[model samples]
Target: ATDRLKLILAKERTLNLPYMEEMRKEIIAVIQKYTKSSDIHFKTLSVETIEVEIILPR
Candidate 1:
């Protein structure tokens, strides 16, 4: 049995970061590969802080 966790930002970049997209893609590929491995990997894939609404106040 094995446990795995990963976090990847969906944004293009942050301030001066340019490798976020590449890293995010790589992480996803890794996750897919692991799931298809010879192991009953029950995965809970989730994303957090997904911007679904804009905040407005007076």
Candidate 2:
């Protein structure tokens, strides 16, 4: 059996860095304390656009 957890974040570039960092820490905490998968992949969308959104499970 496999466990997959996905998340989506839609926000401006100004808010992206801090929010992303927090998400990373939170996910890392869960991975360290709970899940077994240490491999993680990420992608970014609308890099040149004003508002950006992230789609997980890439």
Candidate 3:
């Protein structure tokens, strides 16, 4: 069925994350290369700081 195909595709997706920090740094580097700080703004209405934290779990 369609659900079976979706599950197979999801499981087949390749993602090798041997180290969390390395992955995070790679992602940050990519973002920094493409966009400037001024161009990127995070506005959380109830949050104290406008900065958003991304937590990559192990």
lDDT of 3: 0.33
Alpha-carbon lDDT, every model: 0.39, 0.49, 0.33
Please provide, for model 2 over 1-58, each residue's C-alpha lDDT reduced to its tens digit, 9 standing for 90 to 100. 4456654555655554645656765755565555445555545553312222222222
Model 3: which residue pairs collide?
Answer: none
| Candidate 3 residue-wise lDDT, 1-58, digit = tens | 1111000111122444355345445655555564433233233222122233333222
Tens digits of per-residue lDDT for model 1, 1-58 = 3444434344332245456445555655565565543322222222322121112221
Each model's TM-score?
0.38, 0.37, 0.33
How well does model 2 score by local distance difference test? 0.49
Find the 10 residues in a row with the least total lDDT in model 1.
49-58
- Please give the RMSD of candidate 3 to the true structure: 16.0
Q: How would you order the candidates by lDDT, starting with the best? A: 2, 1, 3
The residue ranges of model 1 lying beyond 4 angstroms of the native Cα positions read: 1-14, 37-58
Report the lDDT of model 1 for residue 4: 41
lDDT, candidate 1, at 44: 24
Model 3 residue 8 CA deviation in Å = 24
